[PDB]
Design a protein around this ligand. Structure first.
Ligand SMILES: Nc1ncnc2c1ncn2[C@@H]1O[C@H](COP(=O)(O)OP(=O)(O)O)[C@@H](O)[C@H]1O
Ligand SMILES: [Cl-]
Ligand SMILES: [Mg+2]
Length: 405
């Protein structure tokens, strides 16, 4: 961020600060299961308050409510509560993020006020889909809530969304988490140790299958696991995949991706076996399948099996650097957690013999919390897809929109 305004050089004395953060935290049974992303923004928030900010107004999304208000399902109210304990200051929660009531609450706050707005994605204008005039009005409203803007939302920095690129204030500064994460990746990606392995799992298949093409110019090996794998296996192996995650658009480029991996000498490791489930539920009935057997109709693959874990281990053993985004099964539910635990064991072992190991994402970092490995890998990032877009070699939109020096 040498060329961008950052918080260390932003005068906040007597100023209202409006701050985009990534508070898209994981939830199970309605409880926050990892406060990593909240804790990670505390240094920027505290700095603002300690250097005389009149207020700090925090804004984020939670999940993918697709431009409809879903307070019953995706409210940020629980985050406000958690932020209090981590900050040592109280926080006022507002039930919207724009409009006359929100504008009034933020216009002239008591000295030192911390305010958290409701989920930005309850409005279609944040993503811009789910209207140019209402997008402008949404952005205008957000801009009234502070005098200066800070973006500390590293985990969302790949998204060219209204709160991330559309705030119109004279000073738009990168926060300290933004700086910490970008600095770590800049050093780690400049001259990676080789072989350099990417591990791509998870459930955001439509988005992340589109990142593979450019990642194939940067890495020497790739594990394609979790929900990502089934689109590949259906196309390449004619495998029956049941109700497993499948991306129609990505299927159309699978053969081209494999051709490119061959051209570039990138070894691709796909799974060969699975733990199956009869529905998407923690207490589903379960089974086993191989690529050869296929997955029965009406069943979904929610973990890899033991022969897949062996092949993943072989790739980890060859690696001198690893970037991992996306668990290799539904690790939140014990029936489907074994493959991700086994891979974590291998990645921790690799670190101990000198591998540079980077795990990132809202959910994947929660694997580190669950199995107590946060200090047993080289770097745990608050960015998942944001970190993969860095690996591709891009300038992230939320960084690009910051004020130039
Ligand atoms: N085979 C699978 N089917 C469905 N979901 C899966 C599968 N494997 C992993 N997942 C899910 O992937 C999710 C995380 O993916 P994603 O959100 O892309 O990762 P991150 O949050 O680290 O960026 C987890 O909640 C996990 O349950
Ligand atoms: Cl997606
Ligand atoms: Mg996630």
């Amino acid at each position: 961020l040498s060329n961008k305004l950052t918080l260390d050089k932003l005068d906040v004395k007597g100023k209202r600060v409006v701050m985009r953060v990534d508070f898209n935290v994981p939830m199970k049974n309605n409880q926050i299961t990892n406060n990593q992303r909240i804790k990670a923004a505390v240094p920027s928030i505290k700095f603002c308050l300690d250097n005389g900010a009149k207020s700090v107004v925090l804004m984020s999304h939670l999940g993918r409510p697709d431009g409809v208000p879903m307070p019953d399902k995706y409210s940020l109210e629980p985050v406000a509560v958690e932020l209090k304990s981590l900050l040592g200051k109280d926080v006022l929660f507002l039930k919207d993020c724009v409009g006359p009531e929100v504008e009034k609450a933020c216009a002239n706050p008591a000295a030192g006020s911390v305010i958290l707005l409701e989920n930005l994605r309850f409005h279609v204008e944040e993503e811009g889909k789910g209207e140019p005039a209402k997008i402008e009005a949404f952005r205008a409203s957000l801009s009234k809530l502070g005098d200066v803007y800070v973006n500390d939302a590293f985990g969302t920095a790949h998204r060219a969304h209204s709160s991330m690129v559309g705030v119109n204030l004279p000073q738009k500064a990168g926060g300290f988490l933004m700086k910490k994460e970008l600095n770590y990746f800049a050093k780690a990606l400049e001259s990676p140790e080789r072989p350099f392995l990417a591990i791509l799992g998870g459930a955001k298949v439509a988005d992340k299958i589109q990142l593979i093409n450019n990642m194939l110019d940067k890495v020497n090996e790739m594990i394609i696991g979790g929900g990502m794998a089934f689109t590949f296996l259906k196309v390449l192996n004619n495998m029956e995949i049941g109700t497993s995650l499948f991306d129609e658009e990505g299927a159309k480029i699978v053969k081209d991706l494999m051709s490119k991996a061959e051209k570039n000498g990138v070894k691709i490791t796909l799974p060969v076996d699975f733990v199956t489930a009869d529905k998407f539920d923690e207490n589903a009935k379960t089974g086993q399948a191989t690529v050869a057997s296929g997955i029965p109709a009406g069943w979904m693959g929610l973990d890899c099996g033991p022969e897949s874990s062996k092949k993943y281990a072989e790739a980890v053993t060859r690696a001198k650097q690893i970037v991992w985004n996306g668990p290799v099964g539904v690790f939140e539910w014990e029936a489907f957690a074994r493959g991700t635990k086994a891979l974590m064991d291998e990645v921790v072992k690799a670190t101990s013999r000198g591998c540079i190991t980077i795990i990132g994402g809202g959910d994947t970092a929660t694997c580190c919390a669950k199995w107590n490995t946060e200090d047993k890998v080289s770097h745990v990032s608050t960015g998942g897809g944001a970190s993969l877009e860095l690996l591709e070699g891009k300038v992230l939109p939320g960084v690009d929109a910051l004020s130039n020096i």
